């Protein structure tokens, strides 16, 4: 119940990982899509979901 609310969570290391992951995603999001378009001509299950 209220003793299991997210504010009581002790996930500080996971929060640091989350902030670093978000920074990396924002920095590298477009380059990964460009590389996927350059290397993978067609989309297949298991490829990067790109475009619309």
């Amino acid at each position: 119940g209220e003793d299991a609310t997210v504010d009581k969570m002790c996930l500080e290391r996971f929060k640091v990982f989350l902030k670093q992951y978000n920074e990396w995603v924002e920095a590298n999001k477009d380059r990964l899509e460009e590389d996927s378009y350059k290397y993978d001509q067609d989309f297949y299950p298991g490829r990067r979901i790109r475009g619309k």
Binding site: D40, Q41, D42, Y44
Partner: protein
């Protein structure tokens, strides 16, 4: 004259350019139609933009235009259509007919033709030899499926003058069938005549020597096509 026909060769001469434009004004005054059969000479293949600027006025002065597939793709974009032709799916085809690796007979959409369209254009015909006749009108567009057989006579075949025969057949049917400009089925039926005329013209050495007659062209059209397509 009810149809005025000319080629883009006159655009390589300034005197003939001025004379051509005066003749076009005279013909339009009397009610004639302007047939622009491009037939780009060697200089006009250097680059797309200079040729577009050179032919823009005559292009806009024409009611009927005939271009080859190569001419149209050069005028719009050569590399784009070359890339589109060479494309092959990596894993599977989108439909079964794409698995046969058949020859490409891509039909250009009127949206792609939009840069080259203008208000006085009644009919545009794109010819992939005698195999395909892509036609575009302000109301509709389509393709007429044709054929060719020069291997039937390997020692007398000569393709010179085939496009002249196709254009002449188009004009012959246009002068006597005004419903071509407004009826799609009639347009296809009459374009099959020009297809047959182009087919016969490939069977003889020499352009003038091998030009077919109306009787032979009609005979070949009725032989090649099924009776419901006549």
């Amino acid at each position: 004259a009810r149809i005025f026909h000319f080629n883009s060769e006159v655009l390589t001469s300034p005197t003939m350019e001025s004379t051509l434009f005066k003749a076009i004004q005279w013909s339009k005054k009397f009610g004639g139609l302007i047939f622009f059969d491009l037939n780009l000479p060697l200089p006009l293949w250097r680059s797309r933009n200079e040729t577009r600027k050179l032919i823009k006025k005559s292009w806009d002065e024409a009611n009927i235009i005939e271009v080859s597939q190569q001419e149209l793709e050069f005028l719009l974009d050569e590399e784009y259509y070359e890339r589109r032709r060479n494309y092959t799916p990596q894993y599977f085809a989108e439909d079964f007919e794409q698995t046969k690796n058949r020859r490409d007979y891509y039909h250009y959409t009127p949206e792609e033709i939009k840069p080259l369209w203008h208000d006085d254009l009644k009919l545009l015909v794109v010819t992939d030899g005698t195999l395909r006749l892509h036609y575009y009108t302000p109301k509709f567009d389509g393709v007429v499926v044709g054929t060719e057989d020069v291997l039937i006579t390997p020692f007398t075949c000569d393709r010179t003058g085939s496009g002249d025969a196709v254009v002449a057949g188009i004009m012959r049917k246009l002068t006597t069938c005004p419903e071509m400009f407004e009826d799609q089925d009639v347009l296809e039926r009459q374009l099959r005549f020009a297809v047959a005329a182009g087919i016969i013209s490939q069977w003889t050495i020499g352009a003038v020597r091998g030009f077919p007659t109306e009787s032979a062209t009609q005979n070949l059209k009725e032989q090649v096509y099924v009776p419901s397509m006549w």
